[PDB]
Design an enzyme around this catalytic site. Structure first.
Site, mmCIF file in Angstrom:
data_model
loop_
_atom_site.group_PDB
_atom_site.id
_atom_site.type_symbol
_atom_site.label_atom_id
_atom_site.label_comp_id
_atom_site.label_asym_id
_atom_site.label_seq_id
_atom_site.Cartn_x
_atom_site.Cartn_y
_atom_site.Cartn_z
ATOM 1 N N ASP A 45 0.910 -1.182 -0.121
ATOM 2 C CA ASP A 45 -0.156 0.004 -0.050
ATOM 3 C C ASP A 45 0.844 1.229 0.274
ATOM 4 O OD1 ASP A 45 -1.549 -2.202 0.635
ATOM 5 O OD2 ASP A 45 -2.976 -1.241 1.835
ATOM 6 N N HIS A 62 -1.132 4.351 -0.516
ATOM 7 C CA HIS A 62 -2.292 5.777 -0.309
ATOM 8 C C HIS A 62 -1.899 6.917 -0.516
ATOM 9 C CE1 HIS A 62 -5.397 2.522 0.870
ATOM 10 N NE2 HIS A 62 -4.549 2.097 1.582
ATOM 11 N N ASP A 76 -3.677 -0.397 -4.002
ATOM 12 C CA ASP A 76 -3.977 0.908 -2.908
ATOM 13 C C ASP A 76 -3.237 1.862 -3.221
ATOM 14 O OD1 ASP A 76 -6.143 -0.729 -1.994
ATOM 15 O OD2 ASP A 76 -5.415 -0.893 0.073
ATOM 16 N N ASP A 116 -6.392 7.126 -2.048
ATOM 17 C CA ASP A 116 -7.175 7.522 -0.813
ATOM 18 C C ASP A 116 -6.200 7.481 0.226
ATOM 19 O OD1 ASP A 116 -9.392 7.157 -2.167
ATOM 20 O OD2 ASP A 116 -10.102 5.077 -1.728
ATOM 21 N N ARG A 117 -6.744 8.270 1.420
ATOM 22 C CA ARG A 117 -6.011 8.641 2.600
ATOM 23 C C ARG A 117 -5.052 9.359 2.703
ATOM 24 N NH1 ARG A 117 -10.016 8.166 6.077
ATOM 25 N NH2 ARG A 117 -10.619 6.012 7.271
ATOM 26 N N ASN A 144 -8.068 -2.992 -3.525
ATOM 27 C CA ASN A 144 -9.578 -2.543 -3.159
ATOM 28 C C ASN A 144 -9.906 -1.064 -3.190
ATOM 29 O OD1 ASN A 144 -7.979 -2.818 -0.665
ATOM 30 N ND2 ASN A 144 -10.156 -2.242 0.499
ATOM 31 N N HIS A 145 -8.845 -0.356 -3.123
ATOM 32 C CA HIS A 145 -9.112 1.263 -3.328
ATOM 33 C C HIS A 145 -9.092 1.552 -4.647
ATOM 34 C CE1 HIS A 145 -9.233 2.767 0.825
ATOM 35 N NE2 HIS A 145 -8.817 1.453 1.074
ATOM 36 N N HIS A 193 -3.510 -8.513 -3.912
ATOM 37 C CA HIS A 193 -3.692 -7.438 -2.842
ATOM 38 C C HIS A 193 -4.322 -7.843 -1.345
ATOM 39 C CE1 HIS A 193 -3.977 -3.645 -1.116
ATOM 40 N NE2 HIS A 193 -5.084 -3.643 -0.758
ATOM 41 N N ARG A 213 -14.196 -6.447 8.354
ATOM 42 C CA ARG A 213 -14.400 -5.502 7.251
ATOM 43 C C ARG A 213 -15.639 -5.341 6.833
ATOM 44 N NH1 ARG A 213 -9.111 -3.796 5.223
ATOM 45 N NH2 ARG A 213 -7.396 -5.199 5.727
ATOM 46 N N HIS A 260 -2.603 -4.943 1.912
ATOM 47 C CA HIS A 260 -3.786 -4.667 2.425
ATOM 48 C C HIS A 260 -4.187 -4.363 3.877
ATOM 49 C CE1 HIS A 260 -8.222 -4.570 1.893
ATOM 50 N NE2 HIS A 260 -8.462 -6.148 2.490
HETATM 51 C C1 LIG Z 1 -12.558 0.648 4.192
HETATM 52 C C2 LIG Z 1 -13.098 0.097 5.174
HETATM 53 C C3 LIG Z 1 -12.722 -1.329 5.649
HETATM 54 O O1 LIG Z 1 -11.303 -1.542 5.148
HETATM 55 C C4 LIG Z 1 -12.642 -1.398 7.091
HETATM 56 O O2 LIG Z 1 -12.309 -2.349 7.719
HETATM 57 C C5 LIG Z 1 -12.020 -2.413 9.072
HETATM 58 C C6 LIG Z 1 -11.555 -3.516 9.888
HETATM 59 C C7 LIG Z 1 -9.992 -3.543 9.913
HETATM 60 C C8 LIG Z 1 -9.751 -1.928 9.542
HETATM 61 C C9 LIG Z 1 -8.878 -0.932 10.257
HETATM 62 C C10 LIG Z 1 -7.918 -0.349 9.758
HETATM 63 C C11 LIG Z 1 -7.252 0.714 10.695
HETATM 64 C C12 LIG Z 1 -5.613 0.133 10.450
HETATM 65 C C13 LIG Z 1 -7.604 2.125 10.137
HETATM 66 C C14 LIG Z 1 -6.630 3.219 11.208
HETATM 67 C C15 LIG Z 1 -7.183 4.445 10.651
HETATM 68 C C16 LIG Z 1 -6.262 5.829 11.129
HETATM 69 C C17 LIG Z 1 -8.534 4.756 10.327
HETATM 70 C C18 LIG Z 1 -9.410 3.676 10.033
HETATM 71 O O3 LIG Z 1 -9.658 3.686 8.471
HETATM 72 C C19 LIG Z 1 -10.452 2.467 8.014
HETATM 73 C C20 LIG Z 1 -10.719 2.804 6.523
HETATM 74 C C21 LIG Z 1 -9.249 2.619 5.915
HETATM 75 C C22 LIG Z 1 -9.470 2.798 4.050
HETATM 76 O O4 LIG Z 1 -8.434 3.899 6.143
HETATM 77 C C23 LIG Z 1 -8.762 1.385 6.035
HETATM 78 O O5 LIG Z 1 -7.371 1.366 6.412
HETATM 79 O O6 LIG Z 1 -9.098 0.281 5.524
HETATM 80 C C24 LIG Z 1 -11.893 2.848 8.844
HETATM 81 C C25 LIG Z 1 -11.664 2.507 10.148
HETATM 82 C C26 LIG Z 1 -10.670 3.678 10.670
HETATM 83 O O7 LIG Z 1 -10.659 3.558 12.257
HETATM 84 O O8 LIG Z 1 -8.777 2.470 10.287
HETATM 85 O O9 LIG Z 1 -11.186 -1.512 9.664
HETATM 86 C C27 LIG Z 1 -13.537 -2.105 9.864
HETATM 87 C C28 LIG Z 1 -14.175 -0.923 9.207
HETATM 88 C C29 LIG Z 1 -14.188 -1.120 7.735
HETATM 89 O O10 LIG Z 1 -14.546 0.297 7.190
HETATM 90 C C30 LIG Z 1 -14.476 0.280 5.576
HETATM 91 C C31 LIG Z 1 -15.730 -0.662 5.464
HETATM 92 O O11 LIG Z 1 -16.919 0.016 6.005
HETATM 93 C C32 LIG Z 1 -16.035 -0.226 3.707
HETATM 94 C C33 LIG Z 1 -17.284 -1.066 3.045
HETATM 95 C C34 LIG Z 1 -17.188 -2.506 3.598
HETATM 96 C C35 LIG Z 1 -17.457 -0.950 1.669
HETATM 97 O O12 LIG Z 1 -18.477 -1.841 1.446
HETATM 98 C C36 LIG Z 1 -18.913 -1.839 0.141
HETATM 99 C C37 LIG Z 1 -20.300 -2.523 0.041
HETATM 100 C C38 LIG Z 1 -20.023 -4.039 0.260
HETATM 101 C C39 LIG Z 1 -18.817 -4.647 -0.580
HETATM 102 C C40 LIG Z 1 -17.454 -3.732 -0.520
HETATM 103 O O13 LIG Z 1 -17.776 -2.271 -0.781
HETATM 104 C C41 LIG Z 1 -18.954 -0.523 -0.841
HETATM 105 C C42 LIG Z 1 -17.829 0.482 -0.393
HETATM 106 C C43 LIG Z 1 -17.575 0.481 1.160
HETATM 107 C C44 LIG Z 1 -18.697 1.311 1.870
HETATM 108 MN MN LIG Z 2 -6.528 -2.709 0.675
HETATM 109 MN MN LIG Z 3 -4.821 -0.228 2.049
#
Ligand SMILES: C=C1[C@@H](O)[C@@H]2O[C@]3(CC[C@H](/C=C/[C@@H](C)[C@@H]4CC(C)=C[C@@]5(O[C@H](C[C@@](C)(O)C(=O)O)CC[C@H]5O)O4)O3)CC[C@H]2O[C@@H]1[C@@H](O)C[C@H](C)[C@H]1O[C@@]2(CCCCO2)CC[C@H]1C
Ligand SMILES: [Mn+2]
Ligand SMILES: [Mn+2]
Length: 293
Positions: free
Chosen positions: A59, A61, A87, A90-91, A119-120, A168, A216, A243
């Site tokens: 990644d 980002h 990836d 984003d971010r 996925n990004h 990824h 996730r 990832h």
């Molecule tokens: C992105 C994500 C996931 O990856 C993320 O996974 C989880 C499990 C582990 C992961 C944690 C990561 C941390 C290390 C980071 C650290 C920091 C500082 C910020 C933060 O940042 C996360 C996003 C991101 C980008 O920064 C990432 O690192 O992952 C969100 C939680 C934040 O605290 O956590 O958090 C749970 C929340 C979840 O939230 C979204 C999730 O809702 C996305 C959703 C599933 C999608 O569904 C759809 C429909 C279904 C099929 C797929 O598409 C449409 C598009 C979208 C709405």
């Molecule tokens: Mn990813």
């Molecule tokens: Mn990533």
């Protein structure tokens, strides 16, 4: 007509400048990078078969200056061959410079530079986590959609020297043969759950040996047994993916049958994680080059 050398030049002109300094390419140049790389992506397999030596990165980002640091540490193309696992946007604060440099190098060195889809590199995702907003601010949404059309054509996995499977996210309960991957058609957004979805979203999990639930909210988690069956079935030695943010930039999982790479130091300015890059030589010997925050 696209002046790749000038674009690269301007993009690299900021190495040494104050971190955060923008490089504002013209709209026509960015669209060209998208359209030309798309053509190349479609001209090559969706399941790349690469050969060492190669530098594999996780990644990024949008942390453009960290991307510049990776190249300066691993060697700017074509000094070294590269494989990125996705990836790119984003971010971070500079997804545009980041993705443009990568596409630029792909066009410039199509046989020594490779990019996989993360996925990004999905519309529904980068629409919410930064890229869309960055395009809306610095350019326009039409350009964002052009990027999306390019992303829908990125390859999904690669095998290095018939031994290292790269993607990824991870495995899928639907993945039985390598043919299944090779038969995926592009362009494609990933509208349904299933194989491609899993390759882009799954994570290894220490608690279960087989298939588990993914926090996730999409895809699944996979254990060591699943990994073991996969590696033996296709005569592979390791899975290399990204990832997930890891403290040392790289980290082994599933009893060292898999390694996760993450190349964005100090993720989102909140984590104090290091970034890493894995180098693989002709003797299929793996080495890690770390990038401190
Ligand atoms: C992105 C994500 C996931 O990856 C993320 O996974 C989880 C499990 C582990 C992961 C944690 C990561 C941390 C290390 C980071 C650290 C920091 C500082 C910020 C933060 O940042 C996360 C996003 C991101 C980008 O920064 C990432 O690192 O992952 C969100 C939680 C934040 O605290 O956590 O958090 C749970 C929340 C979840 O939230 C979204 C999730 O809702 C996305 C959703 C599933 C999608 O569904 C759809 C429909 C279904 C099929 C797929 O598409 C449409 C598009 C979208 C709405
Ligand atoms: Mn990813
Ligand atoms: Mn990533």
């Amino acid at each position: 007509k696209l002046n790749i050398d000038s674009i690269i030049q301007r993009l690299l002109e900021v190495r040494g400048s104050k971190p955060g300094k923008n490089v504002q390419l013209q709209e026509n140049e960015i669209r060209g990078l998208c359209l030309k790389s798309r053509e190349i992506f479609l001209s090559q397999p969706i399941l790349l078969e690469l050969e060492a030596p190669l530098k594999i990165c996780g990644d990024i980002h949008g942390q453009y200056y960290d991307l510049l640091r990776l190249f300066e540490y691993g060697g700017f193309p074509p000094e070294s061959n590269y494989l990125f696992l996705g990836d790119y946007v984003d971010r971070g604060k500079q997804s545009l410079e980041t993705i443009c440099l990568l596409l630029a190098y792909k066009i410039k060195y199509p046989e020594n530079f490779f990019l996989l889809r993360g996925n990004h590199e999905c519309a529904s995702i980068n629409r919410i986590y930064g890229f869309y907003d960055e395009c809306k601010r610095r350019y326009n949404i039409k350009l964002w959609k052009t990027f999306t059309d390019c992303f829908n054509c990125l390859p999904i996995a690669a095998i290095v020297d018939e031994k290292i499977f790269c993607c990824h996210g991870g495995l899928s309960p639907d993945l039985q043969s390598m043919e299944q991957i090779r038969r995926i058609m592009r362009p494609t957004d990933v509208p349904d759950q299933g194989l491609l979805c899993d390759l882009l979203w799954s994570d290894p999990d220490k608690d279960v040996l087989g298939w588990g639930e993914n926090d996730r909210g999409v895809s699944f988690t996979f254990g060591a047994e699943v990994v073991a069956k996969f590696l033996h079935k296709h005569d592979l030695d390791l899975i290399c993916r990204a990832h997930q943010v890891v403290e040392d930039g790289y980290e082994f999982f599933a009893k060292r049958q898999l390694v996760t790479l993450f190349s964005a130091p100090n993720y989102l300015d909140v984590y104090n994680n290091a970034g890493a890059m894995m180098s693989v030589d002709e003797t299929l010997m793996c080495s890690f080059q770390i990038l401190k925050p």
